[PDB]
Amino acid sequence: MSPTEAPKVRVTLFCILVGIVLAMTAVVSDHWAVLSPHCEAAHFGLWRICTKRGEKNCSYFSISAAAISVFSLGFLIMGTICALMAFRKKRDYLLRPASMFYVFAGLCLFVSLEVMRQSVKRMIEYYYSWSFACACAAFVLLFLGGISLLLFSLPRMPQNPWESCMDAE
Protein backbone atom coordinates (compact mmCIF):
# COMPACT_ATOMS: atom_id res chain seq x y z
CA MET A 1 0.00 0.00 0.00
CA SER A 2 3.04 2.21 0.50
CA PRO A 3 4.33 2.38 -3.14
CA THR A 4 0.94 1.89 -4.80
CA GLU A 5 -1.48 3.97 -2.70
CA ALA A 6 0.78 6.91 -1.93
CA PRO A 7 -0.53 10.06 -3.63
CA LYS A 8 2.88 10.89 -5.12
CA VAL A 9 2.65 7.74 -7.27
CA ARG A 10 -0.95 8.45 -8.33
CA VAL A 11 -0.42 12.10 -9.28
CA THR A 12 2.22 10.70 -11.64
CA LEU A 13 0.06 7.82 -12.84
CA PHE A 14 -2.80 10.21 -13.59
CA CYS A 15 -0.33 12.44 -15.42
CA ILE A 16 0.51 9.48 -17.71
CA LEU A 17 -3.25 9.25 -18.31
CA VAL A 18 -2.95 12.71 -19.92
CA GLY A 19 0.06 11.74 -22.03
CA ILE A 20 -1.50 8.45 -23.06
CA VAL A 21 -4.13 10.46 -24.97
CA LEU A 22 -2.04 13.43 -26.14
CA ALA A 23 0.32 10.99 -27.84
CA MET A 24 -2.88 9.48 -29.24
CA THR A 25 -3.98 12.98 -30.31
CA ALA A 26 -0.79 13.26 -32.35
CA VAL A 27 -0.84 9.76 -33.84
CA VAL A 28 -4.17 10.37 -35.57
CA SER A 29 -4.05 14.11 -36.35
CA ASP A 30 -1.96 15.09 -39.37
CA HIS A 31 -1.30 18.76 -38.67
CA TRP A 32 2.35 19.05 -37.62
CA ALA A 33 3.64 20.65 -40.81
CA VAL A 34 2.63 23.34 -43.28
CA LEU A 35 3.76 23.27 -46.88
CA SER A 36 3.60 26.90 -48.00
CA PRO A 37 4.59 27.46 -51.67
CA HIS A 38 2.09 30.15 -52.77
CA CYS A 39 -2.90 27.03 -53.69
CA GLU A 40 -0.80 23.99 -52.77
CA ALA A 41 -0.78 24.21 -48.96
CA ALA A 42 -0.25 20.71 -47.56
CA HIS A 43 -0.40 19.44 -43.97
CA PHE A 44 1.80 16.47 -43.19
CA GLY A 45 1.42 13.68 -40.66
CA LEU A 46 2.13 9.99 -40.45
CA TRP A 47 -0.74 8.38 -42.29
CA ARG A 48 -2.41 11.00 -44.48
CA ILE A 49 -1.11 13.87 -46.61
CA CYS A 50 -3.74 16.47 -47.40
CA THR A 51 -3.39 19.52 -49.68
CA LYS A 52 -5.90 22.30 -49.04
CA ARG A 53 -6.52 25.37 -51.21
CA GLY A 54 -13.94 22.72 -50.60
CA GLU A 55 -11.04 20.88 -52.21
CA LYS A 56 -9.98 18.70 -49.27
CA ASN A 57 -7.86 15.96 -50.92
CA CYS A 58 -6.45 13.71 -48.20
CA SER A 59 -4.33 10.71 -49.26
CA TYR A 60 -1.13 8.79 -48.49
CA PHE A 61 2.26 8.77 -50.22
CA SER A 62 6.80 9.28 -43.66
CA ILE A 63 7.03 5.49 -43.56
CA SER A 64 9.82 5.54 -40.97
CA ALA A 65 7.82 7.66 -38.52
CA ALA A 66 4.70 5.57 -39.09
CA ALA A 67 6.56 2.31 -38.49
CA ILE A 68 8.32 3.81 -35.47
CA SER A 69 5.02 4.99 -34.01
CA VAL A 70 3.55 1.53 -34.10
CA PHE A 71 6.04 0.82 -31.33
CA SER A 72 5.32 4.03 -29.46
CA LEU A 73 1.59 3.21 -29.40
CA GLY A 74 2.01 -0.52 -28.77
CA PHE A 75 4.58 -0.20 -26.03
CA LEU A 76 2.25 2.17 -24.21
CA ILE A 77 -0.58 -0.31 -24.51
CA MET A 78 1.63 -3.09 -23.12
CA GLY A 79 2.82 -0.82 -20.31
CA THR A 80 -0.76 -0.22 -19.26
CA ILE A 81 -1.33 -3.98 -18.82
CA CYS A 82 1.51 -4.07 -16.32
CA ALA A 83 0.23 -0.88 -14.67
CA LEU A 84 -3.47 -1.76 -14.56
CA MET A 85 -2.69 -5.13 -13.02
CA ALA A 86 -0.26 -3.75 -10.45
CA PHE A 87 -2.92 -1.89 -8.48
CA ARG A 88 -4.58 -5.14 -7.45
CA LYS A 89 -3.60 -8.33 -5.62
CA LYS A 90 -0.96 -6.51 -3.55
CA ARG A 91 1.84 -6.60 -6.12
CA ASP A 92 3.95 -3.50 -6.61
CA TYR A 93 7.04 -5.05 -8.13
CA LEU A 94 5.02 -5.32 -11.32
CA LEU A 95 4.84 -1.58 -11.63
CA ARG A 96 8.59 -1.44 -12.17
CA PRO A 97 8.21 -2.64 -15.77
CA ALA A 98 5.22 -0.35 -16.33
CA SER A 99 7.53 2.58 -15.82
CA MET A 100 9.93 1.09 -18.33
CA PHE A 101 7.50 1.03 -21.18
CA TYR A 102 6.48 4.60 -20.60
CA VAL A 103 10.05 5.76 -21.03
CA PHE A 104 10.25 3.70 -24.15
CA ALA A 105 6.92 4.94 -25.39
CA GLY A 106 8.32 8.36 -24.64
CA LEU A 107 11.47 7.81 -26.65
CA CYS A 108 9.71 6.13 -29.54
CA LEU A 109 7.87 9.36 -30.24
CA PHE A 110 11.15 11.27 -30.10
CA VAL A 111 12.46 9.17 -32.96
CA SER A 112 9.14 9.81 -34.66
CA LEU A 113 9.54 13.54 -34.05
CA GLU A 114 13.02 13.48 -35.58
CA VAL A 115 11.78 11.30 -38.45
CA MET A 116 9.00 13.75 -39.32
CA ARG A 117 11.37 16.73 -39.27
CA GLN A 118 13.51 15.25 -42.05
CA SER A 119 10.48 14.93 -44.33
CA VAL A 120 9.67 18.63 -44.00
CA LYS A 121 13.35 19.55 -44.29
CA ARG A 122 13.83 17.68 -47.58
CA MET A 123 10.66 19.19 -49.04
CA ILE A 124 7.81 26.40 -49.65
CA GLU A 125 8.21 26.75 -45.86
CA TYR A 126 7.53 24.92 -42.60
CA TYR A 127 5.33 25.56 -39.58
CA TYR A 128 3.88 23.24 -36.94
CA SER A 129 0.89 24.22 -34.85
CA TRP A 130 -1.44 21.45 -33.72
CA SER A 131 0.35 18.10 -33.44
CA PHE A 132 4.09 18.57 -33.16
CA ALA A 133 3.74 20.59 -29.98
CA CYS A 134 1.11 18.06 -28.98
CA ALA A 135 3.56 15.18 -29.30
CA CYS A 136 6.37 17.32 -27.93
CA ALA A 137 4.12 17.66 -24.88
CA ALA A 138 3.46 13.91 -24.84
CA PHE A 139 7.11 13.07 -25.32
CA VAL A 140 8.05 15.28 -22.34
CA LEU A 141 5.13 13.89 -20.41
CA LEU A 142 5.78 10.18 -21.06
CA PHE A 143 9.55 10.48 -20.96
CA LEU A 144 9.48 12.27 -17.61
CA GLY A 145 6.41 10.74 -16.11
CA GLY A 146 8.18 7.45 -16.69
CA ILE A 147 11.51 8.24 -15.05
CA SER A 148 9.81 9.85 -12.09
CA LEU A 149 7.42 6.90 -11.68
CA LEU A 150 10.54 4.73 -11.73
CA LEU A 151 12.19 6.62 -8.89
CA PHE A 152 8.82 6.81 -7.10
CA SER A 153 8.71 3.01 -7.17
CA LEU A 154 12.33 1.97 -6.74
CA PRO A 155 12.75 1.81 -2.92
CA ARG A 156 15.10 4.72 -1.96
CA MET A 157 18.74 5.46 -1.81
CA PRO A 158 19.61 3.62 1.39
CA GLN A 159 20.63 6.68 3.50
CA ASN A 160 21.94 4.62 6.45
CA PRO A 161 24.71 2.05 6.79
CA TRP A 162 22.30 -0.63 8.02
CA GLU A 163 19.70 -0.41 5.20
CA SER A 164 19.79 -2.25 1.86
CA CYS A 165 17.73 -2.10 -1.35
CA MET A 166 15.11 -4.80 -1.64
CA ASP A 167 15.08 -4.54 2.17
CA ALA A 168 12.36 -6.61 3.80
CA GLU A 169 8.76 -5.27 3.56
- Angle in degrees, 0-180, between the axes of helices 132-151 and 10-26, rounded to the nearest 10: 150
Closest CA to 150 of 69, 93, 84, 89: 93
Resolution in A: 2.9
CA distance 35 to 151: 42
Domains along the chain with CATH numbers:
1-169 (1.20.140.150)
CA distance 100 to 118: 28
The CA-atom distances, in angstroms, between 111 and each of 1, 83, 115, 117, 135 are: 36, 24, 6, 10, 11
- Residues 4, 87: contact at Cβ < 8 Å? yes
Residue 44 C-alpha from the chain's centroid: 19
Experimental determination technique: cryo-EM
Task: Please give the sequence-ordered ranges of beta strands (E in DSSP) within 27-114, or none if there are none.
Answer: 41-43, 49-52, 57-59
Q: What are phi and psi of 107, to 5 degrees?
A: -80, -15
